Amino acid sequence: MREIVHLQAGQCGNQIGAKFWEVISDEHGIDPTGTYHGDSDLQLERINVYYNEATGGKYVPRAVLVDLEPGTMDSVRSGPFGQIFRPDNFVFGNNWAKGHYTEGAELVDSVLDVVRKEAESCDCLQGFQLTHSLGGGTGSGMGTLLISKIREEYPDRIMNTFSVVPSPKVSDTVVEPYNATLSVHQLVENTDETYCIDNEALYDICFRTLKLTTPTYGDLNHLVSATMSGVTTCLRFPGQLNADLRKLAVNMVPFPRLHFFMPGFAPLTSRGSQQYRALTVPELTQQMFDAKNMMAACDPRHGRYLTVAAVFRGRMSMKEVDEQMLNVQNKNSSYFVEWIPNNVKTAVCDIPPRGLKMSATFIGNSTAIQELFKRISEQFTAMFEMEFTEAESNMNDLVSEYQQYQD
Amino acid sequence: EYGVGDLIHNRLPDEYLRGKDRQRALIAAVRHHLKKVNYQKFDTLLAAFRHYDKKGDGMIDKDELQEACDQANLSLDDKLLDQLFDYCDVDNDGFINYLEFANFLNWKDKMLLKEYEERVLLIKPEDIVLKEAGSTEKTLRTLLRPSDKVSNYYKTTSSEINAIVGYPICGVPTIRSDIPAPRIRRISDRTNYGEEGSAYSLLYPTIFARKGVFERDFFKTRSKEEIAEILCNIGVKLSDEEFENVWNLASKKHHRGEVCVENIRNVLDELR
Amino acid sequence: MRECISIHVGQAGVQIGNACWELYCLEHGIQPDGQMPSDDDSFNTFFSETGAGKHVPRAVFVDLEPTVIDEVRTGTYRQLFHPEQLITGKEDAANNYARGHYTIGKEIIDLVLDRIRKLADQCTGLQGFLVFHSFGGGTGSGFTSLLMERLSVDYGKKSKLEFSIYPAPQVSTAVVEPYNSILTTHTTLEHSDCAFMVDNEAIYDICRRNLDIERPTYTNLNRLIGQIVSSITASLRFDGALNVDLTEFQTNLVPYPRIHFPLATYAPVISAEKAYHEQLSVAEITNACFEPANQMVKCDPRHGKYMACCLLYRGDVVPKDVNAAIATIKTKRTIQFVDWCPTGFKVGINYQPPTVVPGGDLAKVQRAVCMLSNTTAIAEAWARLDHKFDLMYAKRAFVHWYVGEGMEEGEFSEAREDMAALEKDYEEVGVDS
Amino acid sequence: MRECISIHVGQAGVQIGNACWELYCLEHGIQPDGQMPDDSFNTFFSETGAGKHVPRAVFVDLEPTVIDEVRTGTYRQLFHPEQLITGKEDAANNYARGHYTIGKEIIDLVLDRIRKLADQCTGLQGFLVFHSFGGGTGSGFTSLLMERLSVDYGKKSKLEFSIYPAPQVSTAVVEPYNSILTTHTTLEHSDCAFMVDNEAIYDICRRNLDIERPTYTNLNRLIGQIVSSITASLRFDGALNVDLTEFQTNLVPYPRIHFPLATYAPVISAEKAYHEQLSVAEITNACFEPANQMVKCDPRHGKYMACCLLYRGDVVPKDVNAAIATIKTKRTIQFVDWCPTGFKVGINYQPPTVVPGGDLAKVQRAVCMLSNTTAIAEAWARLDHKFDLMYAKRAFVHWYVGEGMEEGEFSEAREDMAALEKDYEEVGVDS
Ligand SMILES: Nc1nc2c(ncn2[C@@H]2O[C@H](COP(=O)(O)OP(=O)(O)OP(=O)(O)O)[C@@H](O)[C@H]2O)c(=O)[nH]1
Ligand SMILES: Nc1nc2c(ncn2[C@@H]2O[C@H](COP(=O)(O)OP(=O)(O)OP(=O)(O)O)[C@@H](O)[C@H]2O)c(=O)[nH]1
Ligand SMILES: Nc1nc2c(ncn2[C@@H]2O[C@H](COP(=O)(O)OP(=O)(O)O)[C@@H](O)[C@H]2O)c(=O)[nH]1
Ligand SMILES: [Mg+2]
Numbered sequence A: 001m002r003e004i005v006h007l008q009a010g011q012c013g014n015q016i017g018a019k020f021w022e023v024i025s026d027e028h029g030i031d032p033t034g035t036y037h038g039d040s041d042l043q044l045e046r047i048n049v050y051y052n053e054a055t056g057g058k059y060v061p062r063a064v065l066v067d068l069e070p071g072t073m074d075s076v077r078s079g080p081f082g083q084i085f086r087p088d089n090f091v092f093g094n095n096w097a098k099g100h101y102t103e104g105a106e107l108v109d110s111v112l113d114v115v116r117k118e119a120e121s122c123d124c125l126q127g128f129q130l131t132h133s134l135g136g137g138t139g140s141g142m143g144t145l146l147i148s149k150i151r152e153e154y155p156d157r158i159m160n161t162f163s164v165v166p167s168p169k170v171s172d173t174v175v176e177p178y179n180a181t182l183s184v185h186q187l188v189e190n191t192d193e194t195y196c197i198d199n200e201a202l203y204d205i206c207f208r209t210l211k212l213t214t215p216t217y218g219d220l221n222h223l224v225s226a227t228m229s230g231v232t233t234c235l236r237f238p239g240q241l242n243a244d245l246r247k248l249a250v251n252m253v254p255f256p257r258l259h260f261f262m263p264g265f266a267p268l269t270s271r272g273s274q275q276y277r278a279l280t281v282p283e284l285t286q287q288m289f290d291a292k293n294m295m296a297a298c299d300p301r302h303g304r305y306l307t308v309a310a311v312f313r314g315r316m317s318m319k320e321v322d323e324q325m326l327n328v329q330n331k332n333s334s335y336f337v338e339w340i341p342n343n344v345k346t347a348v349c350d351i352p353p354r355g356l357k358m359s360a361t362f363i364g365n366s367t368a369i370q371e372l373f374k375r376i377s378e379q380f381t382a383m384f385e386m387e388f389t390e391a392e393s394n395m396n397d398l399v400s401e402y403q404q405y406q407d
Numbered sequence B: 001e002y003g004v005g006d007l008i009h010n011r012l013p014d015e016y017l018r019g020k021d022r023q024r025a026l027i028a029a030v031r032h033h034l035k036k037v038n039y040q041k042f043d044t045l046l047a048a049f050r051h052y053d054k055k056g057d058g059m060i061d062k063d064e065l066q067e068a069c070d071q072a073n074l075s076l077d078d079k080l081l082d083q084l085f086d087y088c089d090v091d092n093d094g095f096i097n098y099l100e101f102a103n104f105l106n107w108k109d110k111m112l113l114k115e116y117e118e119r120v121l122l123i124k125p126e127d128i129v130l131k132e133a134g135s136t137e138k139t140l141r142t143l144l145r146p147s148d149k150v151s152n153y154y155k156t157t158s159s160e161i162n163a164i165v166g167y168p169i170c171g172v173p174t175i176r177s178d179i180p181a182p183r184i185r186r187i188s189d190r191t192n193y194g195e196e197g198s199a200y201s202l203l204y205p206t207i208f209a210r211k212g213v214f215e216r217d218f219f220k221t222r223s224k225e226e227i228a229e230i231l232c233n234i235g236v237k238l239s240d241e242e243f244e245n246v247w248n249l250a251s252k253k254h255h256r257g258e259v260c261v262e263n264i265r266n267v268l269d270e271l272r
Numbered sequence C: 001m002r003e004c005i006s007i008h009v010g011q012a013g014v015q016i017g018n019a020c021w022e023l024y025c026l027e028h029g030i031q032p033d034g035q036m037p038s039d040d041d042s043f044n045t046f047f048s049e050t051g052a053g054k055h056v057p058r059a060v061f062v063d064l065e066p067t068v069i070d071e072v073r074t075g076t077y078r079q080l081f082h083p084e085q086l087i088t089g090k091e092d093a094a095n096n097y098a099r100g101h102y103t104i105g106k107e108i109i110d111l112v113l114d115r116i117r118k119l120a121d122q123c124t125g126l127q128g129f130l131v132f133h134s135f136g137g138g139t140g141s142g143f144t145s146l147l148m149e150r151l152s153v154d155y156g157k158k159s160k161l162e163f164s165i166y167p168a169p170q171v172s173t174a175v176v177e178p179y180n181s182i183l184t185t186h187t188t189l190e191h192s193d194c195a196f197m198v199d200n201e202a203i204y205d206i207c208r209r210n211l212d213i214e215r216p217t218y219t220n221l222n223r224l225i226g227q228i229v230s231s232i233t234a235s236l237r238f239d240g241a242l243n244v245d246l247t248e249f250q251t252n253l254v255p256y257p258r259i260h261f262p263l264a265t266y267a268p269v270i271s272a273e274k275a276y277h278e279q280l281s282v283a284e285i286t287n288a289c290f291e292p293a294n295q296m297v298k299c300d301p302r303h304g305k306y307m308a309c310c311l312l313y314r315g316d317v318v319p320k321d322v323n324a325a326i327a328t329i330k331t332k333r334t335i336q337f338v339d340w341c342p343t344g345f346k347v348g349i350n351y352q353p354p355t356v357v358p359g360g361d362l363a364k365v366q367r368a369v370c371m372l373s374n375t376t377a378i379a380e381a382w383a384r385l386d387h388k389f390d391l392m393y394a395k396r397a398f399v400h401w402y403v404g405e406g407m408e409e410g411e412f413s414e415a416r417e418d419m420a421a422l423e424k425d426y427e428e429v430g431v432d433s
Numbered sequence D: 001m002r003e004c005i006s007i008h009v010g011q012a013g014v015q016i017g018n019a020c021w022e023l024y025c026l027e028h029g030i031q032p033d034g035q036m037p038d039d040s041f042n043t044f045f046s047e048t049g050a051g052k053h054v055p056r057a058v059f060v061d062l063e064p065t066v067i068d069e070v071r072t073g074t075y076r077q078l079f080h081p082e083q084l085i086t087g088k089e090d091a092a093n094n095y096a097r098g099h100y101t102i103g104k105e106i107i108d109l110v111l112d113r114i115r116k117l118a119d120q121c122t123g124l125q126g127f128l129v130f131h132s133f134g135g136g137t138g139s140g141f142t143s144l145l146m147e148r149l150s151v152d153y154g155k156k157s158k159l160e161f162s163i164y165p166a167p168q169v170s171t172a173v174v175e176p177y178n179s180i181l182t183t184h185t186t187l188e189h190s191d192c193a194f195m196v197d198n199e200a201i202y203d204i205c206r207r208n209l210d211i212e213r214p215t216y217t218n219l220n221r222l223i224g225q226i227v228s229s230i231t232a233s234l235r236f237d238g239a240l241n242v243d244l245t246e247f248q249t250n251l252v253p254y255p256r257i258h259f260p261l262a263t264y265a266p267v268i269s270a271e272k273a274y275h276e277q278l279s280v281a282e283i284t285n286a287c288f289e290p291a292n293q294m295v296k297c298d299p300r301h302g303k304y305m306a307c308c309l310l311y312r313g314d315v316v317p318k319d320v321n322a323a324i325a326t327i328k329t330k331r332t333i334q335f336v337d338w339c340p341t342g343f344k345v346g347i348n349y350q351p352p353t354v355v356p357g358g359d360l361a362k363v364q365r366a367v368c369m370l371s372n373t374t375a376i377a378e379a380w381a382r383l384d385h386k387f388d389l390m391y392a393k394r395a396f397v398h399w400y401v402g403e404g405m406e407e408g409e410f411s412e413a414r415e416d417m418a419a420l421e422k423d424y425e426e427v428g429v430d431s
C-alpha cells in the first residue's frame, strides 16, 4: 500500500544498507535464500513495503546498489545476506568532481532507469531512502546528484537520507571539509529528512555505555541500522498510536530549512549490568534523554530543543508515556523553546524488536547541530571557485537561522 | 567476543553471531546454488529426492550429500558440509527428511504438489496444507527454525485484549427482601422489607386485609392439629387419608417452609 | 422502528468502536458470528436482521489509513461487520487538516455517501447520527469537517451527536493539535446540534484514584467511554419509566444555537474490592457526579455556572429517591445555577441495570447514572487552546505544510476571530441581571 | 437513628482506636470479617446489603508503618480500603510540620471522608477525635482538623480523648512546647475534652490489676472501656439514658472550663474479685478515692465543680441515692458553694463485656466517672514552668520557625495559658 525505494551509495552507505537489510530480514523472518520462516502472520501482512515477491514466494529487496568500484560491490555480494538482492540492481562503474561531473555523469542514466522502473512497478509509492556519507567523493558527488534528479522527477514524495557526518578527531581524509561543504548545498535544498550519524559518537557509545574493547565497523553499522528500522516500523507493523513518515515530517519540520535530525536507540545495556538493571518506561525515558546516548558529537546542554519525538516498540501503557514526557518537559523547562508548546511527540507500536520485550527510538531536532556546522565551516575556511563561496554563504545562512530562532 | 547485536537482542552465549559471517555466506551460497540446480534439472520434487537418496532408505546422509554436491559441481570442505547438514537437520535426528529437504534444499512453491505426489509414507497427513486461503491447490508445511519462533514474541495489544466472545451482585436493593422483617417496627424504621403492598390493595382491600390477616400469616407454617382444626372450622370436611394426601402434596410443592396456608389452599384448588 | 446510525472516523473513533460494538453484543446476547443463541424489539436501533437470522450492525468505518481498519478485518469481529461498510484508503492524513479535507478527503466521500444512502433506505425511522473521532488528528479533524456539509445538505433537520476527544491541557501526543482543533470547531458550530466532549488526562486520574489502575491503557479508556454511549442510547433500546428520545434531550440541552457543548460524567466507577464495603444508594451516586474530582473533562466546574443538566439513570431506581436527591443539591451553595434557568434538571429512568464486561476492571452495580452538563466553565478550557494557537501562529510556524495542498492562509485568521466571538458568547450569557 | 463519627489521628489515637474496635465488635457479636453470624449497631456500623458491616471510622496518619499493620492485620476486611489515609515523612514531633507544611497536603482528602460519612447519616450526635498532646501529628494536625469542622458543622458536639503529658514520665524533649500550642487553638474549637496520662495508668495497673510490667497494649484496653461506657447510653436501653449533648451542658460551667477527668471503677483482676463483694454503694467510694484517679494530680488540693456518674449493669436507683447523699455529708470531699447540686447519675442495663486475653474481670456492675475539679490548676502551673525554662534561652525554636511558624506565636500562647490559670483562681474563691 505504501512503499519506500532504497538507494545505496558509497562504501559506508553500502555497508550500512546491507546491515539494514539483514536486520529487517530477520525481523520479518526471511531466509537469506528468500523463503519466509516465522510463526507470526504479522510478518507477512506487510511485506510489500520493502520487498517484491518473485515467482514461487521468493522475496527480493527494493534497493538499488550504486558504486563506481567493483570491490565494494563484490564485498556486498559475498557478504552474509548478499545473495537476496536483484542481480540487475548492482550498478557499478575520492573526488567530488569525479563523483558529480566527470565519472558519475554517465552512470546516472542507468541508475535512474532502474529507479524509475522500480517506482513504476509500485502500486502507490510513499517515499525514498538513501544511505551514504558526506565525506566521501562517491557518496557525496553521486548522492547529491541522485537526490536532485529524484526530487526533480517526483515532487510530492517524502525523502529520508541517512548521512554519515564528518568527525573532528576520527577523520581519515583531508578533502573532508571540502566534500562536506559541497554536499550540504544540495542537502539543504532538496531534502525532507536528513539524519546525521557520527562515527566518533558511535565509538564513544561502544566504549562507555556498552563497554566494547574492539568495536568492528559491522558493529558500528548495526547500531545505526537498528535506529533505521525503529524509525520506520510504524509503516510495517500495527501499533496503538500509528505515525508514518509524513506524520513525522509534518510534526517535526517547523521551517523548511530545519530538517536535520539526531537519532537514538534506547534499550542499550552491556552484559554485566543486564541482571542489575530492570527495563521499563521511566528508565527507558532516562536512557533516551541521556546525553551520552546521542548519535552525534553535539552536546544538548549547550543549545535548545525545537521538536523531539519518540517511537516505542512493545507492550506498554500510554499513561506512563504521557506522564514521562510531561514530567521531563517540566523538569527541563529551559532546554525547550517557549514559543512552541508541547515539544514532545509519542508514537507506540504493538510489536517489539528481536529478542527484547520493549524498545525506544529517539529522534531530535535541536539547535545543537549549529556547532557541528560551524566546525566544518571553520575547517573549510582555513583550507580555502565561486560555488565554494556560495556554499560557505549558505552554511553561514543556516547557522544564522539556527541562532536567530534559538534566541 | 560478542559484538553489539548480541547485546542489543539479548542473545544467549551459545548463540553468539560474532565470527561466523563467512560461513553463513558460504552456506547461503551453496543452498541457493543447490536449489537452482534442482529446479533446472528435476521437474518433480519426489524425483529430485529419489535422485539424492541413492541408497533408497528414505533418508539423506552426509556421504550422500557429499556425492550429491560432487554431482552438482560444488567443492565443499568437510566442516562446511557438516555445518550445512546441521542447518538442514532441524529435528537433530541425524537424517535429512522429505520435509526439510523440500524446505531448505529445493523450491517448494514453484513445483505444485500433484496427485501422484500425494499418492506416494514419506509425508504425514499433517504435512499437507492449502497453498493459500480459499484455494483448492495444496502444498507442504513450512518447518520452522528454532531462531524464528516468534508466536509469543509478537502479539497485538488492542484487538487481542479486546477480544471477548458473548460474581454475585454487590450493593443494596431498593426492597430489602434479604433481611427478615422485625416482629415490631420502630417508629424511626422506614426501610421497605416488602410487606407494604400495592396501592390497589391499600385502596380496595380484600377481606383478609380488612380484618388483619396478611401475607405473613398466609406464609407462616403451622402444625398438623392446627391445620386440622382450621379445616374443620372452615367446614371443608375431609377424611384422614385425603388430609394426609393434601399434606404430602403441600410438602412436595416446596420443601423449605412447607405446608403453609397458601400451599394448602393451592393444593385444595388444584384437586377441586 | 426507532433506529440510529453510527460512523467511526479516524483511529480514535474506530478504536473506541471496537470496544463500543462489543458492549452492544454483550447486552443483547449476540455472538460475534452474528446470530443469537438457539436456546424481540430491543436490538433494532443498532442491528438489522437478515433473512438467514444473522444480525448485521449499522456502522460505517472510514479511515484514510489501512493499518487500523485491517486490524478489525483480521480481528475476532470479522464475521459481524458488512464487508462494504469497511472503507479504507492510503497514506493517511499525517496530522494535517489539508490532507483530510482538500486533497485526499475528496477521493473517498463519494463512496461514503453511497453507504449512508443505503442504510437510510432500510431504516423505517431515523432519529440521529453518531460520529466518533478526535480533534487532534488530521483525519479526525479534516474528514469530519467536510462530512457534515455533505450530510446536512442530504438530510435536513436530523440530529447529529458527536463524542469527540478534547486535547488535554497538559499531555499531548502531537504538536499541531492546537492548529487542528481550531479548524474543526470553526465548522461544527453551524452544522452540528450537540457535540459531546471527553479528554484523555481526566480519564487517567479516574483509573488511578477510583479503580486503582496504576498503568491505564487505551483499552481501559475505550471501555469506559463505551459505557457512556451505551447509557445515552439505552432509552431507545429498552423500556423505562422516563424514556428519553434523541430529539427531546436536544431541546433541553441547547438554549442558544451556539452553546451546544456539554460534558459527560458517569457514576459509579469503582473496583471490585470497594463495592463490597461501599453502600451505593440513589442519593450517593447522584452526588458522585458533582464533585470536582469526577468530571471526565479537565476543568473546574466551581468557577462557572451550570445551565442545563440531564441525569440519565439505569437499573433499580424509583422516582421518589431521584426528586428528593435533586432538591438536596439545589440548596447546596457550591453548585451555582444561572438565574434565568430556574429548572435545569432533566431525568431519565431505565429498567435495565448496567452490564459488566467479563475480564474488565469495572464492577457490576444495580444502578448507574450518566450525567450530561451544559456549563459555562469550558470557556476557560477554550481559553487555554486559543493561547496555544496564539504563540504558534505568531511566527507562522507549521504553515507551509498546510498551504502546500491548496489551503489558503486567510482561513487561519478567520477561524481565530470566530473563536474569540465564541468565548465572548459565554461571557455574554453568564452575566446575570 | 443516633450515630457518631470517630476520627483517629496520630499513633496514640490509632493504636488506642485499634483497641477500641475489638471491644465494639464483641459488644454486637460481629466477626473481624465484618459479617454477623435490633438497631444497636447503627451508632457505629453502617450495614451493606451482603450482610457486611463497615465502621464509622476514619484512620488518618502521616506515617505508613502504623496504618500498614491495619491493612495487614486481622482487621483488614473490616474497614473501607480508602478510609485508611496514609501520608509520608510524618511530622517528627514538630507542630509546624503537622500544621503548616505537611498537614495542608492531605486535609482536603481527610475532610472529604467526613462529608461522605455524614451524608449517609440521618441524625448526628457528635464527633470522637482521638489524639495526644505530646506529638506533633497528634497536636498539629488535630488543630487544623478541628478549626475547619467548626465552620463546616455549626453546633455539633465534638469530644476529644487526649493523652495528657505526665509530670514525671515523658518520652519527648519538646513535649512541653507542643501542649501549650495545642491548647491555644483548641480552646475555641471544641466542646469537651477528656484527658488521661501515662503515669497514673501505670500505678493503677500495678496496685489494682497486679501487673508488674504494664505495656501500651494493656493501657488502651482500659481507655477503650471508658469510651465504651460513654456511648453505651446511646446503643442500649436503660433506666436513665444520657445523650452526648446532655452531659455536654452538665459538665461545662464556663466556656473555658471544659477539661474533665475520667476515671473508672472497678478495675481489678479475676482472682481478686472472687473474694470481694462489689455493690453500688462501694464502687462509687473508690471513684472519689485519690489513688484511683486517672490523671496524676491531687484531688484534695482542689475543689469539685460538677461530677457525672455513669453506672452500668445491675444497679438500682435507691442504692445510688444512699451513695450520693453519703458523699455530700463528708468533709474533705469539698464542693464549691456556688454549685449546690453537683451530681448526675446514669443507669444502664447491659453490663461490660470481657475481651479474650484481657486482664479485667467480669463484674456485674461497673461505673465510669467524669469529674470537673479545680485541682488541675497546679497541673497547668507546672507545665507553664516547663515551657518557660526552655524558652528563656530560645532552645528548640529554630526548628519550629523553619517550617513557617513565627517567633511571636510562642509568646502569644503563654499569656493565653496564663489567662487560663487565673480563671480557676477567679472562680475557685468563694463569695
Ligand atoms: N480514547 C482514545 N484516544 C485515542 C486513541 N488513539 C488515539 N487517540 C487520540 O487521537 C489523538 C490524535 O489522533 P490520531 O491518533 O493521530 O488519529 P487520527 O485522528 O485518525 O489522525 P491520523 O492518525 O493522522 O489519521 C491523540 O491525541 C489521542 O489522544 C485511543 O485508542 N483511544
Ligand atoms: N495510652 C497510650 N498512649 C500512647 C500510645 N502510643 C503512644 N502514646 C502516647 O503518644 C505520645 C507521643 O505521640 P506518638 O505516639 O509519637 O504519635 P503522635 O502524637 O502522632 O506524634 P508523632 O509520632 O511524632 O507523629 C507518647 O508520649 C505516648 O504517651 C498508646 O498505645 N497508648
Ligand atoms: N559506520 C561505518 N563508517 C564507515 C565505514 N567505512 C568507512 N566509514 C566512514 O566513511 C568515511 C569515508 O567515506 P568513504 O569510504 O571515503 O566514502 P566513499 O568514497 O563514497 O566510499 C570515513 O570517515 C569513515 O568514518 C564502515 O564500514 N562503517
Ligand atoms: Mg490514523
Ligand SMILES: [Mg+2]
Residues within 6 Å of the ligand: D010, D011, D063, D090, D091, D135, D137
Ligand atoms: Mg507519628
